[PDB]
């Protein structure tokens, strides 16, 4: 019955990631604590340096850990964004003082984009053995196992600063939450299956629900950056915010940022709501300047998608508490 947190680093409010320790001696990684995803990646030393990705993230050397477990079974980890490949590898895992031995993915095949714009060097996947590629037991279960944690919960604080440097960028309650960054009550939302965190979503407002009227899914997704649907769902979202597509994402031109009305997200029978501070990158107010919105457009295929991902965006305003023992997910304001 004890209680552990990850201190997270927010890069430009787009990139959360913590350190962990893999072997002995603990070699250390900047990683993505991902509920979206189910497998522990870092890149591995054979990793051809021909990727400048692992020419410029630090690279697990299983010759370096006396602690290494030989597998060497080949994944693939498909992402939205793209592509990871190598082979399963064993280690003593710690994260927040908690050791775990762990099969996780030592990457050898690691595209330079995306992956050079990575300020992290892997993911920590926060799924479901469901979701994980080649049957990989993932850490929390791992954690769970050891009957250490208070609570079969785990959950996320993520910082609207990213700037002030003397200030905490994010943090992972391991077997509870911190109240010292939410306030109000917590609400709970049952997932639609096991196996994802994925919830019943029931209206997306701009302003009057113009989107998911029928009812659509809502991936909770704290490695991703933005809020993110469908293509169809995005574009009908923009045309009525006025934004213009670009190649990457969608802007609106700087002065207009503040006018933008609320996007509004009907989740477990509660309006979500977020203002255009809570998803306009204001880094200016001219009209000669464009504005990068949080929100992108992102297919995810089946059987987890077509779906909506709230991520970063939305985790900042809403601290989010996973909770395993009762399939479920907590929103609070977070503070
Ligand atoms: C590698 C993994 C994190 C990929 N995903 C991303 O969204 C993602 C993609 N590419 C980038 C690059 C390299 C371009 C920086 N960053 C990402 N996320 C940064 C972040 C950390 C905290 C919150 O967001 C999703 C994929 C679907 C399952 N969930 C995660
Ligand atoms: C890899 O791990 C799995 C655990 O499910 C095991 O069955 C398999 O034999 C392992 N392979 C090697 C070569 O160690």
Redesign the pocket.
Known sequence: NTTSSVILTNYMD????GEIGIGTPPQTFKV?F????SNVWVPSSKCSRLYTACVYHKLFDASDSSSYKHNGTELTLR????T?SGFLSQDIITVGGITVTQMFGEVTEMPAL??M????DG?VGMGFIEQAIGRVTPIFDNIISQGVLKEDVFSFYYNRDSENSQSLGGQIVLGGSDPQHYEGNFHYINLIKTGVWQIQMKGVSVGSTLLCEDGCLALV?????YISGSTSSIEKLMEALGAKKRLFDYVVKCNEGPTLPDISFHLGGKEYTLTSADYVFQESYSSKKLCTLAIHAMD?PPPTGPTW?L??TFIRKFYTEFDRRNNRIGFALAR
């Open positions: 787009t990139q959360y990631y993505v991902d509920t979206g995803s992402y939205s964004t793209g990871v995306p992956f714009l990575a300020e992290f993911v997704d704290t490695g991703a950056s995810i991902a991520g970063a």
